[PDB]
Design a protein around this ligand. Structure first.
Ligand SMILES: Nc1ccn([C@H]2C[C@H](O)[C@@H](COP(=O)(O)OP(=O)(O)OP(=O)(O)O)O2)c(=O)n1
Ligand SMILES: [K+]
Ligand SMILES: [K+]
Ligand SMILES: [K+]
Ligand SMILES: [K+]
Ligand SMILES: [K+]
Ligand SMILES: [K+]
Ligand SMILES: [K+]
Ligand SMILES: [Mg+2]
Ligand SMILES: [Mg+2]
Ligand SMILES: [Mg+2]
Lengths: 432, 566
DNA sequence: TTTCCCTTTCGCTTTCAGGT
DNA sequence: GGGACCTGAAAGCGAAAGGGAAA
């Protein structure tokens, strides 16, 4: 099937400089490049495009090559809701048996058009620049680019296109990281399936026969809701750190500033706010009374209330990381909606004396969670790092490399300008 | 099979040949006919034409160039392959070595048949009365944007088998300049014999007249001995320093020898500062006596200073010195200097903290050491206590990124040698007067300022100032300065301005950026002197500005605000 | 609720060096 | 006036953002 070339916003080549790597990693890079050369997945390159690569040692002792494709993905031209007059998941007869393929279980080897191979280039540097670098380009899509939703959706559509047409009676669709094919007769289905299996194997989709699952629509639609459901979270302001006048003045400043937005009458937090009365020494002690505690619960209740029930189905999710004391805080958002809070499990926190490591571990864990809720990586991760500090982290931090493996979205430090999100950034929250 | 070009467009372009002076025209004719003889160029009937001309080599011979600007604009760029010069210091010390430079490199590498038509040109007649003769390139034209990638790829393939058969040989290859080094003279001979075969098999010729076998060698702008290395260029333009352009020339000269001869960023502060002003290259600039002391110090360092070829078996160490302006790094192997590592004179932030500069430098120099020798240093020496390193790992994000995955030793034992003694240090490495947390049992002062130029503090004593400033922020910084002057005792300070608070808390160890508002620079400078001259510590924090909450800090903040009205 | 007061941070232009 | 590709450094300036008053 002659591959269709990808759509690009611009034809201007982007070159992101490869950095020096230590010998062990240069040796691992050459080893893995040759492995891929033998499988015909890469070939030598002279491209003006370049994307950085790095290698991660598994505990096996083997290395895996990751590529940072942010710069290339940013140039992909997104396509519209193609085949929108195709059937929805709701509209199948419940008397029909359903076949369920999990695309995370599969392996993809999607051939590139001649003209697209040059854009997926990379360099292995030489020690001391003693020799020219070795350069290469992918002849098949690198696995990270499947995290672009457009690419993935388009590819599976083309892969299912002929099986769907021929099998008009069969209803075959791609629902959020699951390929479904369902027909009324069990044996009418097995025919449709085995055509599909053969057709997508031709396009480059390896299907795992062992992993395949079978079940009725009602079991599926119903379980799906329970599998991807938002975790309701009775989130609280952390109180153990609140000891001195200076602690309370800072926190009560931020509460009083956000109070109108939360719809709490001015007079209604007088018990809380009167704690400021007394000794003017910044380290003088202050304690929350039960009354003051109940007033803090009003602000917590309103913050809890902001959490949505269900995600919008078109829009992608984003991740905010805040550099809170002890350990970092994440929030999953869909643009201006708050979705859910993310933390490291509390037992594991003392294990990581590098705050950077904790940021990286949180991003990896929350990426997985976001993929569970929506079926895709977030399209942006917001970190308390400058672009230069992101660049140095990719270079030096193994934790960062693991945490941001196969990420093709935006990484930046531009936080929302909504008053609620500014208020959450200024305060420390925890979930008991 | 050789590397073909990718063309955007097939529409040929004709750029007229231009006149040449007799001497240059003869040289053009001399070289052009010789290439013909070698079969590197061929007679042309192409509707493409590019100009050709000559320039002087260092040989004294001439170079045939093709002005291929319009043709290059139609060729897809290839990716670069060698970002910066190899360092000779990594050639293992006391190792016999040979230096090879291939003869007319680009012209010995064939062009793909179909591209030759596009590199067509016109040679004028020795006589202005007689007609021109037209040729084309069958080999890499000097002037073609991809010639370098193609030449590197071609020679690299030729050297690859030499690398494989002699894995214990140090082989540097830059375009056509080639170094070979081995442990023993016998091992060098075996290495070289193999090389001659492989360059000849690829149709490349070693210039026999220009081979080096003997000290002292010259390679990629460096004088290389058995151990000692210095830049060839031992001279900076210091005589005529009247224009901007004159200082640009001198400072470019110095920059090129900085890394080997060890000039810290602070030692050039006065020279760099004179670059500031009118953008015109011909703008006047005065030499200051401070700038001259700087040139004397550079000139002494040119004569004394050097770097060293290293043992191939020993790892490197990184020394970071708390030098004035910005920290300075040295890559070293025990006592032998490899390279200096320096920070920019001008900054990004208004307030660049010395601890972040240490961390930036360690990160940048770790990558450089990794590029030189293939590993991190086994040891990083920092002008920090055990306690400060501990605090840095907890609190500094830059330090965390800087030392992420550093598996070696961090320590503060410098070599007891005298050689580094001349370097001018600072004691403003970490905050010692500026406190992270409020002081115990200390007076609390509250400051404010107004666009009407009024400034005040209040609390245990009161004062209003009429300040020259028309900014609330600038007025309040004068209040903060007066507070730091008039309370010769531990103090806590509460200000409503994030701006004033961040400036005051960060100035102690800061590099202050050279802004285009001198008035602000003078204020930040006075604030910095005020903090540094303190007898006692202080702590400054932000109160949100108009909360009208209860308590004593609101009360005093409101008193300060009233003291600076109308 | 967006739409401007600045100010500060980032990216880019334009000089100089240097290497084949 | 007159080529190509790389590296490093300097100052200045224009683009865009952060914050927090102003529309
Ligand atoms: N100003 C320069 C210097 C060099 N080069 C390129 C083309 C040359 O072919 C190659 C090597 O430069 P040399 O000085 O060795 O020139 P030749 O290859 O012509 O060597 P030789 O003079 O020994 O014949 O580098 C260039 O394009 N422009
Ligand atoms: K480029
Ligand atoms: K997927
Ligand atoms: K090569
Ligand atoms: K400066
Ligand atoms: K500032
Ligand atoms: K190059
Ligand atoms: K300048
Ligand atoms: Mg030569
Ligand atoms: Mg104030
Ligand atoms: Mg309005």
């Amino acid at each position: 099937p002659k591959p269709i070339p990808l759509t690009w916003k611009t034809e201007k080549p982007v070159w992101v400089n490869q950095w020096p790597l230590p010998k062990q990693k240069l040796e691992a890079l050459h080893l893995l490049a040759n492995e891929q050369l033998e499988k015909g997945h890469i070939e030598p390159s002279f491209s003006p495009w370049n994307s950085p690569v790095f290698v991660i040692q598994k505990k096996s002792g083997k290395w895996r090559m990751l590529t940072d494709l942010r710069a290339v993905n940013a140039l992909i031209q997104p396509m519209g809701p193609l085949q929108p007059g195709l059937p929805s998941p709701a509209m199948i007869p419940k008397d029909w048996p359903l076949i369920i393929i999990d695309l995370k279980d599969c392996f993809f080897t999607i051939p590139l058009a001649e003209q697209d191979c040059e854009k997926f280039a990379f360099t292995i540097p030489a020690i001391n620049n003693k020799e020219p670098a070795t350069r290469f380009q992918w002849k098949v899509l690198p696995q990270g680019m499947l995290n672009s939703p457009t690419i993935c959706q388009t590819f599976v559509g083309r892969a299912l296109q002929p099986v769907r047409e021929k099998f008009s009676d069969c209803y075959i669709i791609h629902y959020i990281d699951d390929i479904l094919c369902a027909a009324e007769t069990k044996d009418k289905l097995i025919d449709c399936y085995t055509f599909l299996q053969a057709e997508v194997a031709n396009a480059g989709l390896a299907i795992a026969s062992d992993k395949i699952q079978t079940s009725t629509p009602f079991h599926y639609l119903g379980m799906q809701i329970e599998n991807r459901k938002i975790k309701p979270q009775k989130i609280e302001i952390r109180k153990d750190t609140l000891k001195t006048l200076n602690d309370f003045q800072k926190l009560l400043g931020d509460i009083n500033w956000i109070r109108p937005t939360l719809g709490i009458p001015t007079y209604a937090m007088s018990n809380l706010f009167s704690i400021l009365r007394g000794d003017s020494d910044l380290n003088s002690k202050r304690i929350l009374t039960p009354e003051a505690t109940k007033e803090i619960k009003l602000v917590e209740e309103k913050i809890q209330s902001a959490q949505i029930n269900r995600i919008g189905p078109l829009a992608p999710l984003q991740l905010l990381i805040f550099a809170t004391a002890h350990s970092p805080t994440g929030i999953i958002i869909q643009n201006t909606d708050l979705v859910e809070w993310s933390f490291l499990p509390h037992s594991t926190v003392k294990t990581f004396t590098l705050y950077l490591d904790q940021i990286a571990t949180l991003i990896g864990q929350t990426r997985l969670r976001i993929t569970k809720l929506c079926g895709n990586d977030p399209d942006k991760i917001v970190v308390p790092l400058t672009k230069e500090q992101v660049r140095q982290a990719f270079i030096n931090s193994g934790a960062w490399q693991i945490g941001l493996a196969n990420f093709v979205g935006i990484i930046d430090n531009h936080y929302p300008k909504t008053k609620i999100f500014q208020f959450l950034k200024l305060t420390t929250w925890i979930l008991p | 099979k050789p590397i073909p070009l990718t063309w955007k467009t097939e529409k040929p372009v004709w750029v007229n040949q231009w006149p040449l002076p007799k001497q240059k025209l003869e040289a053009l004719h001399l070289l052009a006919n010789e290439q013909l003889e070698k079969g590197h160029i061929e007679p042309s009937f192409s509707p493409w034409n590019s100009p050709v001309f000559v320039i002087q080599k260092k040989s004294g011979k001439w170079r045939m160039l093709t002005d291929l600007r319009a043709v290059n604009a139609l060729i897809q760029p290839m990716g670069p392959l060698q970002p910066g010069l190899p360092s000779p210091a990594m050639i293992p010390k006391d190792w016999p070595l040979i230096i090879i430079d291939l003869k007319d490199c680009f012209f010995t590498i064939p062009l793909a048949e179909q591209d030759c038509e596009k590199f067509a040109f016109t040679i004028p007649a020795i006589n202005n009365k007689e007609p021109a003769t037209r040729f084309q390139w069958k080999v890499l034209p000097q002037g073609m944007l991809n010639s370098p990638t193609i030449c590197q790829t071609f020679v690299g393939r030729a050297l690859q088998p030499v690398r494989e058969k002699f894995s214990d040989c140090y082989i540097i290859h830059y375009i056509d300049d080639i170094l070979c080094a081995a442990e023993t003279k016998d091992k060098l001979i075996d290495c070289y014999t193999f090389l001659q075969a492989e360059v000849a098999n690829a149709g490349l010729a070693i210039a026999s007249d220009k081979i080096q076998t003997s000290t002292p060698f010259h390679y990629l702008g460096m004088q290389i001995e058995n151990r000692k290395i210095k830049p060839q260029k031992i001279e900076i333009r210091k005589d005529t320093l009247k224009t901007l352009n004159d200082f640009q020339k001198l400072l470019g000269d110095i920059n090129w020898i900085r890394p080997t001869l060890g000039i810290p960023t602070y030692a050039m502060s006065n020279l760099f500062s004179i670059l500031r002003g009118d953008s015109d290259l011909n703008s006047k600039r005065i030499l200051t006596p401070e700038a001259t002391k700087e040139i004397k110090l550079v000139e002494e360092k040119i004569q004394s200073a050097q770097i060293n070829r290293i043992g191939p078996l020993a790892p490197l160490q990184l020394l970071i010195f708390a030098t004035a302006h910005s920290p300075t790094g040295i890559i070293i192997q025990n006592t032998d200097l490899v390279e200096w590592s320096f920070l920019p004179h001008s900054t990004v932030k208004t307030f660049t903290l010395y601890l972040d500069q240490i961390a930036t430098l360690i990160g940048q120099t770790r990558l450089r050491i990794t590029k030189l020798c293939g590993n991190d240093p086994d040891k990083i020496v920092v002008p920090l206590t055990k306690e400060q390193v501990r605090q840095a790992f907890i609190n500094s994000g830059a330090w965390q990124i800087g030392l992420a995955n550093f598996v070696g030793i961090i320590d503060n034992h410098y070599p007891k040698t005298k050689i580094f003694q001349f370097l001018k240090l600072t004691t403003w490495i970490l905050p010692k007067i500026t406190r992270c947390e409020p002081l115990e049992n200390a007076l609390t002062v509250f400051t404010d300022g107004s666009s009407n130029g009024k400034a005040a503090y209040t609390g245990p004593k009161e004062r209003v100032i009429k300040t020259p400033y028309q900014s609330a922020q600038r007025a309040e910084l004068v209040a903060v300065i007066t507070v730091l002057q008039d309370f010769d005792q531990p103090i806590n300070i509460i200000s409503d301005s994030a701006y004033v608070v961040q400036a005051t808390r960060d100035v102690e160890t800061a590099l202050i950026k050279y802004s285009m508002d001198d008035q602000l620079n003078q204020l930040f400078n006075l604030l910095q002197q005020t903090v540094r001259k303190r007898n006692f510590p202080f702590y400054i924090t932000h109160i949100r500005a108009h909360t009208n909450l209860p308590g004593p800090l609101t009360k005093a903040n409101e008193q300060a605000d009233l003291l600076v009205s109308s």
